[PDB]
């Protein structure tokens, strides 16, 4: 899928160093220079490093690149909240005769206090039930950092079917929000004592449950 | 100074074809190769190919060989990328990015100048207005409280929808969540509003949901 290889994610406290690896082969990095792009959310990729270690005008010296044999590396010092973005390496492959990219590394800057999520669980409305559908809605908010997993139970038994969960999204207050939906038949809704939405955050669990 | 201005954002059906444009200004169009780079949402960058603006000559990435046509209109300084036989996995942001100078034997191969990118959404789904359902106040899930009530905006296509409360009069304590995409190919979202318990029965709460693509407006009163 992607010819160059990067770690999917790195993270750091403000002020610290992070390093992002880009691994290739003799057919790409072994023969060609490596360039690096910083993609802020909603933006086109922005050239961050070119020709292994050069910076475009405007790019801070906190960003440095290096290349070695068949890999390349992007070093970031004095990590800032502004550095939160996706980082891509790029080169060219002579075997493929094609430009090649790394799969990207998501950098998170831990610029807020850790916070457990608030969890609100809504039962199906009578209107949806009359449409012979049923959706439980689990709303998760004000957690930090922005990574949760959601587990649904019917009574005590887990349900994986019909579960749809958004990725976390940054609120206006810089904490995160997410939602999870459990689709049921109205029969399924009525035929259990309860349904639970369990949200796991940093190895801690917050749970809400509702009942017909 | 140099600007790459893109167009062609849309929602397509699988099997169809899309043509995205990239108009170059601020330099002599014919002096630099033009490249196309796609990015499926949440995913990485994918080189599609390049075009020589002077000659019209092209080189396509392997993956797209059977399906892509890159052209140029030198008189409008515009490069075109047409992708055919679209399927859902062609859902992506399509960027044009300027390459190295055409005549140079050893030219640069990073991308400094990018177009803003154009979203192409490929889905079998047809335009569908949402069903709106009230999320009746669960008093025992807002510790402290207050209490949160809301509106579920279910099964619409395509994005976006917008929601307000009380025709926009109520704005505080309002949280409208990012939509989710379901197996049906349809989207759903919720909007919730955190509110003083004693004010539940004294008004009250009406969610106004606008889905422009389907010309649907729903005003849902949420009773406790």
Residue numbers in the entry:
A (entry chain L): 1 to 9, 11 to 27, 27A, 27B, 28 to 95, 95A, 95B, 96 to 106, ...
B (entry chain H): 1 to 52, 52A, 53 to 82, 82A, 82B, 82C, 83 to 100, 100A, ...
Question: What do the study authors state?
Answer:
An intriguing feature of one class of bNAbs directed against the primary receptor binding site of HIV-1, the CD4 binding site (CD4bs), is that they are encoded by the same heavy chain gene segment, which encodes critical contacts for this class of Ab. The demonstration that several of the most effective bNAbs are directed against the CD4bs, a functionally conserved region on the exterior envelope glycoprotein, gp120, has elevated the attractiveness of this target as a neutralizing Ab determinant.
For the most potent of these MAbs, GE356, an Ab minimally modified by somatic hypermutation (SHM) as shown by analysis of its putative germline sequence, a Fab structure was obtained. Structural analysis allowed the interaction between the GE356 Fab and gp120 to be investigated through epitope and paratope alanine scanning, as well as modeling analysis of GE356 binding to monomeric or trimeric HIV-1 Env structures. These data showed that the VH1.23-using CD4bs-directed GE356 MAb interacted in a similar manner with its target epitopes as observed for two previously described vaccine-induced macaque VH4-using CD4bs-directed Abs.
